Amino acid sequence: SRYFKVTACIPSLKRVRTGRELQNTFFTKLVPYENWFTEQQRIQKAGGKVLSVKLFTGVQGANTGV
């Protein structure tokens, strides 16, 4: 399956949190292609900015094996 490597930064505008949030704030992650759409939306809704997106696995414009 196609996989996405995503780097994004998210700010906590609603509430101040005592516990360390640094992992949540800046998170380079591998996302399944199917999941990424929803994940991208979630980052946008948070007001976080997605710094970089790359397709880690799979071939672009492949009809099958996707």
Using CB under 6 A as the criterion, which residues of the chain lie in contact with ligand CYC when the complex forms? 11-12, 16, 20-22, 25, 36-37, 40-41
56 binds other proteins (CB under 8 A): yes
- Determine the number of helices (DSSP H) and then strands (DSSP E) in the chain: 2, 3
Cross-strand pairs, 52: 7
DSSP at 46: H
Please, how many CA atoms are within 13 Å of residue 40, restricted to the half-sphere of its CB? 13
38 binds other proteins (CB under 8 A): no
Contact residues toward other proteins (CB under 8 A) are: 4, 8-9, 11, 13-16, 18-20, 22-23, 25-26, 36, 40-41, 43-45, 47, 49-58, 60-66
